[PDB]
Paper text:
The polysaccharide-degrading enzymes are primarily virion-associated proteins like tail fibers, tailspikes, base plate or neck, whereas some are soluble proteins, released during bacterial lysis.
Phage LKA1 encodes a trimeric tailspike protein (LKAgp49) with a typical conserved N-terminal structure-associated domain and an unconserved central and C-terminal region with predicted polysaccharide binding/degrading activity (Pfam 12708 and right-handed β-helices). The resulting mutant – gp49d – constitutes a ‘catalytic module’ of the tailspike. Gp49d and gp61d display 32% amino acid sequence identity and can be superimposed with a root mean squared deviation of 1.6 Å between 572 (or 97%) equivalent C-alpha atoms. The most conserved residues form an intricate system connected by hydrogen and ionic bonds with Asp497 coordinating His494 and His499. The three residues are likely to be the most important in the catalysis with Asp497 being the critical residue. A highly conserved Arg329 extends towards the active site where it forms a hydrogen bond with His499.
Numbering used by the authors:
A (entry chain A), B (entry chain C): 181 to 769
C (entry chain B): 180 to 769
The structure:
């Protein structure tokens, strides 16, 4: 509705300080009240004034030179003509973000204590809320959500359903319980944020290309952002923030170096974005400011993500304050991570990080962690660095005294290709370093393509202990002969186990000078302990004078000696074939 | 192209009746031929005149007060500057919908009878159709698609491939057969419908925020709609209706209370929308008007949905006239439903409705119903309401004489967390109330996280009968000891079954004063009938004078007495240990 | 956009207006439109072309613009309209290859040292004109350097620059393949902004393409409607991260290749939320034989509904054999789909049959992994009379040949497959060797099947060549009727490590006091590829008078077994009493 040209923008790609047009600061401020100095860029002055007008701003193709950030409280509405509508910080730029909009957390009355899964909140006095309003429940106590980091504090975003007196009902169930004496409540007050069809060429100075903070349903669509600093796009304390159809590339400056990060956000996500950043193309986390609650129901879909493989870290990120978030239908070059609680990767294609691993874990609070029908590729071998291809604390402190809820690690279907492992390598490692909770494993349905391999599961205990409900390896295709199904220490060894069935038909021939004949079997896979073995004689009835009793003696985790013995010890009177049909498995759960 | 300001709009948020500007109605009608009274809103008159010009309408930021719907026939093109372009019914509003566009159903010739799966339609005379045209085959006979409601009539939308004389080929196979003597055919005649980047604040009076009816490929994008009445967005009899990137919030007025509903629609769906509504955030169904055919190939993807949990109903809806529709990659707070035919939930996260159940059924015609790799949560327990966590007629008439096709209920992978069930609760219930078709269950691969639990399956018959092709429980993680695998009545009990394997190794020591030694085993899970049991002796050969024959006697659904007996009844001559390796399962299909 | 066709003199009223209506001479017309060719050219075309030529973004108001020549550009093309009422319409007099087109450039870079697959470092022979974010193509001009199935399936790929230090260029993702430095030419992709949105092209019968975008980084097509009766509604050629979204594309075809949207030699990007029809392939991938014709990689089709002409006899959803690491996800596909190339997946798709009755067909299999991941499949027909599986891998065509050079894994995981009209001779999946010598592995796992009659799950044949598979697995299937064959397996398939489902039951036998044995026959519900591993145990009786009896099976075969209870020493049983013979059978080799 307004343009920067209407407020005097030039936008020709060259510098135009206000001094080119105004002899005095007072004269410049008569036109641009918030100009700071005559050396400020006319393009910046014009863009900021247009934003300040309160009308949606349309930015025609041009190359706008700015020395300060374009910022707003409340609302920010900017739409360009596409990638040719360029906002470009100059070498003289100062400020935290190229574009920014910041809403408000406004104190609400305190509340009564409330249980997890409730949809009713009792305020101490009349709350200024109506249906559709958004508020944050916030616990200022350090580590109130997770002990892994100080800043992982508890709370969540609620959406008002109805209000009756001091009672406020909400539109979806609470993720967590709150003691009323420990939380402060804030109404999220913000205007309309919609940023579309522009290109930010941020350079090396600003920390963020775009910052949107404490806003309900901001929208970023069809943008291009390049930067060499901390974050291409940073959503902080936003509810239903969406960024869609955008290309974000952050070369980094050697800091946290994020492409798109959702800090203390709830709902929304990224859809159909192509993203590169040095460390984490997409990430979740937050800060330590008021309202720094966990990241929940944030969904990354249909993106392609790349990072700098030499950074050594995972490309797709969640930090340990995430709960109930996922990457879905994403192509992820350079690895992914399980952190926090209740995290899923669904139908993603994921390649390895530099260490050779594909999925790595950290800061596991507990809950369920899932690789759902993913396609996994590694060109390396993480075993020399003590990690699994899917790693849970192999060489790091991940399952600790800060892991306070039972954990379920679920690998369902999909495929895993890893041509360059050794006979020492393992597909999944979990190592306890202080936790005392059940750690359950379901490794199920996946098709595996390897050269050499040592083991499917490697389950270790450095400190702490576990009593799992289950330890399951099942329906795997592509396992080569000789591998170990699960090395399991301590409480993993005594866990209720299900292990794959092996078996076959072994011919034995009786001898007329003996009451028995035996034959050795070496299992194609090594079990964690002696499996449950069946043996049955087929394809012969009387071997002369006796049927014979089929047994196995001994049996072990690695094999068994099959035998056919006359019950009473009489020698067989004929020398003839018999088929010993054997099988082995473990079926405790 | 045109703006309401050009036609005299004010849009400042206050009321401006025509009387402010025109002394008589005649005077006003010179400018606005459609004006009804001098009390009409200038903003309404202006917006309607803008629509009536036939040019695309751009609505600049503004708050436009209207007392009547903005409506059109055939085409409607409205685009604003985003959420600050607000259309607002006043207290005096009269009309059914805030914005609406209605296309036409134009008679085509009758047709010859045609079979399901055909791509060739024979018209009785020359049809006015060319490639790309869309028509509806419509059976006006009540319940011609489904007997569950009279308005579930048969027919479908067809897209013309080629026309040769009176023969019309179509671009995809027919879903159903039609007797030519029973159907009337209608060409869908409509123009361009495109509604984008506006906000409708509908209030309590209009039944619909947006209504689009009988239109080919209408588009709704980047809109925000709030309402407290029947439907935020209602697509009726549309082909390839698509709504994208929109936020829809219907507080409801205590009726059907839908967010987005697709009535009698084919193709299209909802993508990347955040939706709240009191009863069903998204739904499908229809009315009883001409062309009220089944809802097909409508796909809801990448949405977050919420409802009022106190409504007691499911948040994500399909009615019984749905065929071949799905929700995929959606976050669903407040439950989902199987109804109609061939319905799936894929990679969704779903929480419980107030009853404690998560997926509920109604109006099952038959076909295949799938929960594919979904993450399911319930904080409650549906068993006291006689419902499973996944429920098929537990407490309602769902599998009845109106269920006319074989049913397959499939649960594949994913997870289910339900910490608060009792030892009486069951994960899935199916109860017959009059149906006679096969009802097949595949409960396969899911990771389960419970405290107490009674049963995996509960399969009951109040009336009717069934001869299932299969009844399968397999590859489940997380089942606690003592649960029942399936309680199965009548034809469920005699169905070909597959039930999980349990087994173990039990040490027994022979005694020199007996020919046998036994040991009791109680299975971890209770089978629906005595399972198929194997026992083999290992890790010992002769026990003095005899090997011993390993048997089980008795066996039952809940356990077995393992035994080692000398074949000839001679007492064992030595007291030595032996391992009885036992296992059980059911392997009929 | 900045400029409009009106500003350059357009009419856009739907009727023809040759330049001769306004200008008496060609010279006078060219004063206004320098690139007009003749006074008979359309004013709408001259105006639209001039608007594009201005270099400003072009906004096209509602109107119906008549053009007799393509609207084209080099480097950049920015066009946005008011939606489907902004119509660009070739006239009967149209001449040109494409209605709308933008072509970027491939600019030679220095040569590189040999590099391994999986590398992220490239060494240039001399200083390269590259910075971070730049895109280049490694190209091998040698015919069939990626796949032997076609000449034009040449090797190479798109790389995105991470950093440059001296002659060393690091890249943002690992190379898919290895390259001999002496065999490749390297090219920078130089292009500007391409953005086409919110217009309708009514192409007609003349143009080969509705929209062509060639050699461009991140072109964007959004909210467009395209109809045509020729070769390709939308053709992306040698593009990196081409995205078409929210569009309706319909190609009636002219009897040629007849594509809706085709990605030729493209890397990254894909199609999202599109409704597409084309006579042959609604969406396809492939390419041409021009410089830079590299494999199609990381192209993702998502959230689309696709239809084709079923009487064409071909699959609706296409990849050609030069595809690697591509997929369809969350698509409704009427008229079948295909596995070709390497590492291809369909995920959460609903797919119906092509005319032959099959649903997924293969061709030009290089090797790697081919996945149907939780798909819903439906056929109204039966492909067996045409010698093809419902899921087919060379049943009646040359698919697994000397050009299949890498181990193949065919995976069917979960989902459902309904096929009510098969016969007792039909098979769900067929794979047939016609010259390949690599392992061919099958995982058929977890699917719920709904059939009337059926012959077999797998039909594994060898016409020529040979195979030593790592695995052959059938497991966790629901809905198989009695009497089917699990796997017909010939040659090396027959000797592969197999996993086959368990069958079992409890059979009552009563001893006789005048014999030392009692037997009972069992016929398995499914026929195994070879004699299965069988267990038998006696339950629910201890001594039958004087003896327990030893439970065995004799004989056993692929189709059944004779269960037996025999006193060990051949003494007659002394009592006639019941016993339960608990039997089971399966194959458990992998
Ligand atoms: Ca390594
Ligand atoms: Ca309940
Ligand atoms: Ca035995
Ligand atoms: Ca056929
Ligand atoms: Na000042
Ligand atoms: Na100054
Ligand atoms: Na503002
Ligand atoms: Na609301
Ligand atoms: Na911290
Ligand atoms: Na012999
Ligand atoms: Na009147
Ligand atoms: Na068409
Ligand atoms: Na002993
Ligand atoms: Na001329
Ligand atoms: Na860059
Ligand atoms: Na060729
Ligand atoms: Na072929
Ligand atoms: Na008896």
């Amino acid at each position: 509705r307004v343009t920067p040209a209407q407020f005097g923008a030039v936008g020709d790609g060259a510098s135009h300080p206000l001094s080119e047009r105004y002899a005095t600061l007072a004269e410049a401020q008569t036109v641009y009240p918030h100009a700071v100095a005559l050396s400020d860029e006319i393009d910046w002055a014009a863009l900021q004034a247009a934003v300040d007008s309160g009308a949606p701003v349309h930015i025609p193709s041009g190359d706008y030179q700015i020395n300060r950030g374009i910022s707003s409280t409340g609302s920010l509405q900017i739409a360009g003509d596409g990638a040719t509508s360029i906002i470009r910080p100059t070498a003289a730029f100062t400020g935290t973000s190229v574009l920014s909009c910041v809403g408000s957390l406004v104190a609400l009355p305190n509340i009564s204590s409330v249980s997890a899964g409730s949809l009713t909140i009792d305020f101490a006095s009349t709350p200024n809320l109506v249906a559709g309003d958004v508020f944050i429940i916030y616990n200022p106590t350090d580590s109130s959500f997770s002990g892994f980091r100080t800043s992982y504090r508890a709370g969540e975003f609620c959406e008002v359903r109805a209000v009756s007196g001091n009672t406020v009902t909400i539109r979806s169930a609470l993720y967590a319980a709150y003691d009323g004496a420990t939380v402060a409540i804030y109404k999220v007050v913000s205007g309309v944020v919609d940023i579309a069809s522009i290109q930010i060429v941020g350079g090396t100075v600003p920390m963020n290309g775009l910052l949107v903070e404490a806003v309900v349903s901001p929208r970023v669509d069809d943008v291009t952002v390049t930067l060499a600093n901390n974050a291409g796009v940073y959503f902080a304390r936003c509810y239903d923030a969406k960024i869609t159809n955008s290309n974000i590339s952050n070369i980094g400056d050697g800091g946290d170096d994020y492409g798109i990060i959702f800090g203390n956000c709830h709902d929304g996500g990224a859809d159909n974005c192509k993203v590169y950043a040095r460390r984490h193309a997409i990430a979740t986390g937050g800060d330590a400011e008021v309202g720094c609650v966990p990241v929940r129901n944030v969904r990354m879909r249909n993106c392609t993500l790349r990072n700098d493989i030499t950074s050594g870290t995972h490309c797709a990120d969640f930090h340990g304050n995430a709960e109930d978030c996922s990457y879905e239908n994403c192509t992820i070059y350079g690895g992914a991570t399980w952190q926090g609680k209740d995290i899923s990767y669904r139908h993603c294609t994921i390649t390895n990080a530099s260490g050779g691993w594909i999925v790595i874990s950290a800061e596991i609070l507990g809950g369920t962690f899932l690789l759902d029908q993913c396609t996994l590729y590694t060109t390396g071998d993480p075993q020399p660095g003590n990690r699994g291809v899917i790693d849970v604390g192999g060489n790091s402190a991940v399952l600790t005294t800060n892991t306070t809820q039972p954990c379920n690690f679920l690998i369902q279907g999909g495929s895993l290709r890893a041509p360059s492992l050794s006979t020492s390598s393992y597909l999944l490692r979990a190592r306890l370093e202080g936790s005392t909770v059940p750690v359950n494993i379901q490794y199920s349905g996946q098709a595996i393509d390897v050269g050499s391999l040592g083991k499917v599961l490697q389950l270790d205990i450095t400190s702490g202990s576990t009593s799992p409900e289950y330890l399951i390896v099942e329906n795997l295709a592509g396992l080569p002969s000789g591998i170990t199904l699960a090395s399991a220490a301590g409480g993993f060894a005594s866990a209720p186990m299900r292990m794959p069935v092996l078996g076959g038909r072994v011919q034995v021939t009786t001898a007329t000078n003996a009451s028995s004949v035996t034959a050795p079997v070496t299992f194609r896979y090594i079990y964690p302990k002696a499996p449950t073995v069946q043996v049955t004689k087929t394809d012969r009835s009387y071997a002369g004078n006796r049927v014979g009793v089929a047994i196995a003696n001994p049996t072990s985790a690695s094999g068994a000696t099959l035998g056919l013995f006359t019950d009473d010890g009489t020698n067989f009177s004929s020398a003839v074939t018999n088929q010993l049909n054997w099988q082995a498995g473990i079926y405790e759960v």
